[PDB]
Amino acid sequence: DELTPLDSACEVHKAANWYEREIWDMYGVFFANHPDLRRILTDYGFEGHPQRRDFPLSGYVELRYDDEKKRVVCEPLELAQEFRKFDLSAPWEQFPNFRNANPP
Amino acid sequence: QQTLPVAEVAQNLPKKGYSPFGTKQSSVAEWSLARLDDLLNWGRKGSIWPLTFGLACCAVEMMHIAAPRYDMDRYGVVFRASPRQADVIIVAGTLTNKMAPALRKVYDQMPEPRWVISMGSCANGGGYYHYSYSVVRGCDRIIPVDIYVPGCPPTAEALMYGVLQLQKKVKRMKTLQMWYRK
Amino acid sequence: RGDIEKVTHTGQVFDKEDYRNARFVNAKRYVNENWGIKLIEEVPPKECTERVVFCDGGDGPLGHPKVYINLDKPGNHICGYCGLRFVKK
Amino acid sequence: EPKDIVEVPKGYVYVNNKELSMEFADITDRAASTMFFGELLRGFAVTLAHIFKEPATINYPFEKGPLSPRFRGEHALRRYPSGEERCIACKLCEAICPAQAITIEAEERADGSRRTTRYDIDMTKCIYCGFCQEACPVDAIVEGPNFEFSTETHEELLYNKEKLLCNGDKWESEIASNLQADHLYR
Amino acid sequence: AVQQVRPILSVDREEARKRALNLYKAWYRQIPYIVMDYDIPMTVEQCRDKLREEFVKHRNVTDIRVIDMLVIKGQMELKESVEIWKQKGHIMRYWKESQDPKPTDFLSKFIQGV
Amino acid sequence: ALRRDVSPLIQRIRAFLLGREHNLALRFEDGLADRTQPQPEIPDGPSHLLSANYYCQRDGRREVLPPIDLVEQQKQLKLPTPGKVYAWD
Amino acid sequence: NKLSGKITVPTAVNLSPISGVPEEHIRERRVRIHIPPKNAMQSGTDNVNTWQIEFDNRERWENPL
Amino acid sequence: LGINRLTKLFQMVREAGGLKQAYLKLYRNDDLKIGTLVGIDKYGNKYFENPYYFYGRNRWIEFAPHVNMDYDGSMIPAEWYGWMHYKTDLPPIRDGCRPKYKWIADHSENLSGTKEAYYPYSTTPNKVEAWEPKA
Amino acid sequence: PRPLKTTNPAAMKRGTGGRSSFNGIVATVFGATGFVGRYVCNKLGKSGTQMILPYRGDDSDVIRLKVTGDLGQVLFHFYNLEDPASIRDAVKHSNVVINLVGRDFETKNFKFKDVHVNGAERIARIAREAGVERFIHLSSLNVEANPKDLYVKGGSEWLKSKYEGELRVRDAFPNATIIRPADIYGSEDRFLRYYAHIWRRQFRSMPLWHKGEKTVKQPVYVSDVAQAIINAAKDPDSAGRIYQAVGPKRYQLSELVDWFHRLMRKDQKRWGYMRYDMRWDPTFLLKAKLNSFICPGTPIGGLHPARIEREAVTDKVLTGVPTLEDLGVTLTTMEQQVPWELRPYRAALYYDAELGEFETPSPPKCIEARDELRLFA
Numbered sequence A: 001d002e003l004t005p006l007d008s009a010c011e012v013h014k015a016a017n018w019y020e021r022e023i024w025d026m027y028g029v030f031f032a033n034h035p036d037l038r039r040i041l042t043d044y045g046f047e048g049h050p051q052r053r054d055f056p057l058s059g060y061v062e063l064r065y066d067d068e069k070k071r072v073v074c075e076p077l078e079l080a081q082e083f084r085k086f087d088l089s090a091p092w093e094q095f096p097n098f099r100n101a102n103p104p
Numbered sequence B: 001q002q003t004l005p006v007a008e009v010a011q012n013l014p015k016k017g018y019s020p021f022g023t024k025q026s027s028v029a030e031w032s033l034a035r036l037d038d039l040l041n042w043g044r045k046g047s048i049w050p051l052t053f054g055l056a057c058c059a060v061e062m063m064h065i066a067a068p069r070y071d072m073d074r075y076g077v078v079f080r081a082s083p084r085q086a087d088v089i090i091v092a093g094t095l096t097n098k099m100a101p102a103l104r105k106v107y108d109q110m111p112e113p114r115w116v117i118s119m120g121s122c123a124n125g126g127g128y129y130h131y132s133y134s135v136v137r138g139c140d141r142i143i144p145v146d147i148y149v150p151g152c153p154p155t156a157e158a159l160m161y162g163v164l165q166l167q168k169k170v171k172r173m174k175t176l177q178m179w180y181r182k
Numbered sequence C: 001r002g003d004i005e006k007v008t009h010t011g012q013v014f015d016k017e018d019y020r021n022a023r024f025v026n027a028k029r030y031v032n033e034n035w036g037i038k039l040i041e042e043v044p045p046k047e048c049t050e051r052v053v054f055c056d057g058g059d060g061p062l063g064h065p066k067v068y069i070n071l072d073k074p075g076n077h078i079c080g081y082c083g084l085r086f087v088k089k
Numbered sequence D: 001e002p003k004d005i006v007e008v009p010k011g012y013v014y015v016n017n018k019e020l021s022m023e024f025a026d027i028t029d030r031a032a033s034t035m036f037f038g039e040l041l042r043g044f045a046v047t048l049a050h051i052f053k054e055p056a057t058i059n060y061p062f063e064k065g066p067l068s069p070r071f072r073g074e075h076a077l078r079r080y081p082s083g084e085e086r087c088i089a090c091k092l093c094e095a096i097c098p099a100q101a102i103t104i105e106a107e108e109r110a111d112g113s114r115r116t117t118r119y120d121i122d123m124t125k126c127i128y129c130g131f132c133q134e135a136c137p138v139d140a141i142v143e144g145p146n147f148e149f150s151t152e153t154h155e156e157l158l159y160n161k162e163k164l165l166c167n168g169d170k171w172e173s174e175i176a177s178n179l180q181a182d183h184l185y186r
Numbered sequence E: 001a002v003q004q005v006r007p008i009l010s011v012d013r014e015e016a017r018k019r020a021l022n023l024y025k026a027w028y029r030q031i032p033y034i035v036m037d038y039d040i041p042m043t044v045e046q047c048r049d050k051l052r053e054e055f056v057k058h059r060n061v062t063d064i065r066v067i068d069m070l071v072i073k074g075q076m077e078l079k080e081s082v083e084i085w086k087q088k089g090h091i092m093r094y095w096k097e098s099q100d101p102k103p104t105d106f107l108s109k110f111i112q113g114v
Numbered sequence F: 001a002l003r004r005d006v007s008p009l010i011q012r013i014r015a016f017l018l019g020r021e022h023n024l025a026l027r028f029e030d031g032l033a034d035r036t037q038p039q040p041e042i043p044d045g046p047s048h049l050l051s052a053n054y055y056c057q058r059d060g061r062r063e064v065l066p067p068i069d070l071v072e073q074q075k076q077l078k079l080p081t082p083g084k085v086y087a088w089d
Numbered sequence G: 001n002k003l004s005g006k007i008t009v010p011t012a013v014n015l016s017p018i019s020g021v022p023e024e025h026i027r028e029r030r031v032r033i034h035i036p037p038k039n040a041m042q043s044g045t046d047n048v049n050t051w052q053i054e055f056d057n058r059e060r061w062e063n064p065l
Numbered sequence H: 001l002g003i004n005r006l007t008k009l010f011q012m013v014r015e016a017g018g019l020k021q022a023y024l025k026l027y028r029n030d031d032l033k034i035g036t037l038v039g040i041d042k043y044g045n046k047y048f049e050n051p052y053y054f055y056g057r058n059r060w061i062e063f064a065p066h067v068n069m070d071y072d073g074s075m076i077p078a079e080w081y082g083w084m085h086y087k088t089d090l091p092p093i094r095d096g097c098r099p100k101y102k103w104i105a106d107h108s109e110n111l112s113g114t115k116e117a118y119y120p121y122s123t124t125p126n127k128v129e130a131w132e133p134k135a
Numbered sequence I: 001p002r003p004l005k006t007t008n009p010a011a012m013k014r015g016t017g018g019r020s021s022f023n024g025i026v027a028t029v030f031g032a033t034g035f036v037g038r039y040v041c042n043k044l045g046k047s048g049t050q051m052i053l054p055y056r057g058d059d060s061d062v063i064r065l066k067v068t069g070d071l072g073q074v075l076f077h078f079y080n081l082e083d084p085a086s087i088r089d090a091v092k093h094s095n096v097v098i099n100l101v102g103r104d105f106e107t108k109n110f111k112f113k114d115v116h117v118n119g120a121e122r123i124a125r126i127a128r129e130a131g132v133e134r135f136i137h138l139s140s141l142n143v144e145a146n147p148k149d150l151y152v153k154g155g156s157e158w159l160k161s162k163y164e165g166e167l168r169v170r171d172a173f174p175n176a177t178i179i180r181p182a183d184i185y186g187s188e189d190r191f192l193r194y195y196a197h198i199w200r201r202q203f204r205s206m207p208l209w210h211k212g213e214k215t216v217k218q219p220v221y222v223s224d225v226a227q228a229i230i231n232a233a234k235d236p237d238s239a240g241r242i243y244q245a246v247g248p249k250r251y252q253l254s255e256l257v258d259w260f261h262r263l264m265r266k267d268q269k270r271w272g273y274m275r276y277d278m279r280w281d282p283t284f285l286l287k288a289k290l291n292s293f294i295c296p297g298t299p300i301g302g303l304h305p306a307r308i309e310r311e312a313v314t315d316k317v318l319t320g321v322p323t324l325e326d327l328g329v330t331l332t333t334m335e336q337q338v339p340w341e342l343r344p345y346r347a348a349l350y351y352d353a354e355l356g357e358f359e360t361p362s363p364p365k366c367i368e369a370r371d372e373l374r375l376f377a
């Protein structure tokens, strides 16, 4: 879950070290015994883990540049053209084989 | 929209002059300041030094232009690594949030007169990643862009065509001639 | 300037007191000179014998998908895709 | 040739198994190479030589090219041989456009025909992928061959239908050529 | 409505405070260095004041596990400020000085739109 | 008389300096293909066969099954090794 | 006296602070758990077998440009 | 030395029109080559091809004289564009199979940074009608 | 009941606030490429406002302002103050105009009259004919109907011109808002760059009129001035009201400069700050006169005599004349702003002495009303 931690493969395969950092950044799945759980991809001071499916595609904030402050500031989101989804849902079940198979 | 003149119209017309200002100057000061602007623009136009920022995918075209097929130093363009010695910055690739402050810092550490070419769609308007939580939608939101080279990436011809367009902009800039009015 | 006066065939002119006019103080307002409505009007209505004709508009695979248009009605019949016009009489 | 150092089976080639001989002629060769930089001399003469190859720089914009008939560049909305707009607002081009750079709003012209009112492309979001033209069922929109469309202002890139129609009118001859070349082949 | 579940770090609310207050030590002790290192307007007293409010940001956290994570985030951000990976923009982010506090009373909302 | 080459002297020295017989690299119209070509016909496919060509008896997407549980497979019913041993050595 | 450090905690653990959503959205926005409506002029009904959640419309204006 | 190369220089330099008419051509194009008049453009341009050179150099253009030094990449017209890119091997003078419709415009440059520049604008008449108190 | 101007919903306020929400304001900002233009325009863009940014310099001087607004929010219109036709064109569609025009020194193409009053009225007349709802002007706080110089004779023309600009602008426009600051301190500002630049300094001895101990100054921060401009532009009920724009706490120039040099680390052992009397030394004036006469552009460090008279002049506020608090603008104090502001100019970290452990620069101390009455006796 999003709360309980998870075992670390750093002690098993040295290859995984960066991956655990990646999932931690991208989902928030803690890893126990991981040497250093620093974020990898997202920028510094980024709040939330975007790869979750309860996270808006465009994020909550976006950056610009200030002249009063000679610096780049994060601002609430503001989109020139709101991302137009398309509802691509099948009305007709195209696959019977998976219908009742794998039931509880 | 306008269109090119036709053969006979060209025949009537004279030479289009060289200095884009023209040669209609009234007095000695006007005529003199016209020439000095022309010399300045000629210097800044002939020798222009990109900074080679080149973050991504677009960068490969930014290298092919240096390559020997559409030679760019042929035009007087050289890749100086140090921004203090670079006169132009070809921002190319996506601008992520981690990069935004870096681009800003690099830009203003460069001394002016500084011109920016926004190569590729990723820099122009965020390109294909426009609705992303981590990308600066365009690079107009960090720095003042001067020339836009559409493409994904732009074919090398397109890029250095834009360079020539920047040269034209560098050619017609009015600094001394119009200081005289200031 | 006429550029910011012309009526786009879609039917838009910025109102005479509308701030969105300002964007053209220094740039042209492109408006196209060929209006499809006028052009197709000029093209005369082709005529045939058979109750049902077929149009592709263009030619071969360079036009729109082949469509069959019945002409039994007295009037004209406009091709859905290309706007060509048919009349059997 | 010197013997190997690891015996190799097929489906492989070891690029270092060759042994560095200790034969006196072999050591003195290497020693002389270092004492008089023979290898540098070989490379030195190469670059001298390769001055005498003619550079392959195209004298752009006078000389220029080459491209191919399929090149994906400036967008254009074509017109029938009568001059009528080809687009019928089927909106597939928008539905497929990976960058969602296309916006369309269509209604009935007074004649009762299904036609667009607004047709917009943002070539700061377009990727010039060509999925739009591969999808359009009447070849209404095409990746015209122009690629020197460079603007000083970002606003100038957002094309609307008027701009797109103008490009179609301007480039119609060339686009006709390519399609005649590729329609039966695409 | 209880669940018999794994821990993360802290087994009791008091250990949680022990960890949470350890972080408060690092942050309090760090503030002067960042005032020096990061050329930003903020002064020590303001940085200290914000640190107080930003812990008060979540006072009524209750679960042992949730408070553990909040500390995990803090230990991270501490290190990112301890070492200078962050940037002057990133550090100032805590103030949100680009946007004016938007209207809040009903008329100001009403007269300024939804 | 065929390709722009430096004068014969420089050619000979150039071959000397390189140490390999040189062959030209720039692409000439003569060298490359007939740059305008006849229209190609793409041969028709084997599923475009005109009869006995039912989709139902050749489709894959409707053929794939869900994953099977191996233990439960056995419940329905040479140390094993994942595959041929490879001497990655 | 332990099962690898297992602990007894309430099942319902609010995660608003750790989540990262700004409190503005959390405090001014609702959610409308429902089943997606069946399209009127369709007849297959294998896209309305799931329970769906979304957030109330806020606003949409038009870009002046 | 000059193995029938100075001879070739004499051809291009002299028949150019003298020292002045070789220097101005060189001064403008940064190179002087020999070809044949493939076809004269409608807009004063002149196209030259010579298979002696290679694909980069195969075909080239001498822009209209009245463009003093303001040459541009877009000056090529539509009917010649394909040939100029090695995109069609059929000179427009030779293939009259291309369309000859009426509505076709005439060419235009990258009109940018000038009063003639395009600028976008909404192409949808307004959506919702306001109530009119007078009526 | 305040009437409305336009009933086109496209031309009508909308959005959530930000770089996209159109605020129903269309503004031209004359003199946008200035010390305060940047702060105004950035504020206006933050609102999501349409700008026309007229300019007379090379557009490259202004291209940076393009970064202040989303697409199409900013247009650059070349004009000249001497071309009324251009100004008419720039204001036709506009809803508001702000007059940030005006130099500190005199030019060869403009005498303080023609640029500072005659041009302003022409702008206002053209604006009024164009039917522009709101007009804003700036006039120094020290404005006097009958200026009297204090140290150098020909150094009060700026003040005379400022009075002339106000009255004629009010004459040619019924209800414009004439905000009135004085000595705005900010980044890239006349105020702090002047007191920092080298030519202003003598060897190590800043010359101040009466040792800078007979002067009261009340500077205000630039953004707070800008934020006031927008807030008074959004409100039309401010129309026809002067506003004395001043900071929170008055100060004595000696207090400021000493604090400045403390901030700059200019006073530890060796740099050796001293304060003269400008009257005692007759060299400072020559520096100003020569520096004016030689520099073609703006004189180095703004050393022209008019700046010298400005520092000499005191800051006389008046009651009844509204203020920033009336405009609902909180005022960042110097104590919050200036330290960071001058951080770039800190220097003098000698090897001979100690650094770092030197205390934070102890702030200055305000001057109260009776304490002022002591000062002036």
Ligand SMILES: NC(=O)C1=CN([C@@H]2O[C@H](COP(=O)(O)OP(=O)(O)OC[C@H]3O[C@@H](n4cnc5c(N)ncnc54)[C@H](OP(=O)(O)O)[C@@H]3O)[C@@H](O)[C@H]2O)C=CC1
Pocket (backbone or CB within 6 Å): B182, I030, I031, I032, I033, I034, I035, I036, I037, I055, I056, I057, I061, I081, I099, I100, I101, I102, I103, I104, I110, I115, I138, I139, I140, I141, I181, I182, I183, I184, I190, I191
């Ligand atoms: N400390 C101060 O400066 C004070 C401010 N004020 C007033 O506030 C306004 C802004 O102050 P500030 O920005 O610091 O002053 P600036 O010297 O920085 O003037 C800024 C703008 O004024 C323009 N300007 C000057 N002359 C002309 C002219 N003939 N035509 C067109 N533009 C001209 C300049 O245009 P360009 O740069 O392109 O040449 C520049 O863009 C001023 O008008 C001033 O009277 C009042 C009290 C004190």
Ligand code: SF4
Pocket (backbone or CB within 6 Å): B056, B057, B058, B092, B093, B094, B119, B120, B121, B122, B123, B127, B128, B151, B152, B153, B154
């Ligand atoms: S614009 Fe296209 S070529 Fe450039 S970085 Fe983006 S995807 Fe790559």
Ligand code: SF4
Pocket (backbone or CB within 6 Å): D086, D087, D088, D089, D090, D091, D092, D093, D094, D104, D135, D136, D137, D138, D139, D140, D141
């Ligand atoms: S796919 Fe073609 S016909 Fe359909 S809307 Fe797009 S351009 Fe028009």
Ligand code: SF4
Pocket (backbone or CB within 6 Å): D093, D096, D097, D098, D099, D100, D101, D102, D121, D125, D126, D127, D128, D129, D130, D131, D132, D133
């Ligand atoms: S080329 Fe691709 S991205 Fe561009 S408009 Fe067409 S479909 Fe969209």
Ligand SMILES: [Zn+2]
Pocket (backbone or CB within 6 Å): C055, C056, C057, C058, C064, C079, C080, C081, C082, C083, C084
């Ligand atoms: Zn048809």
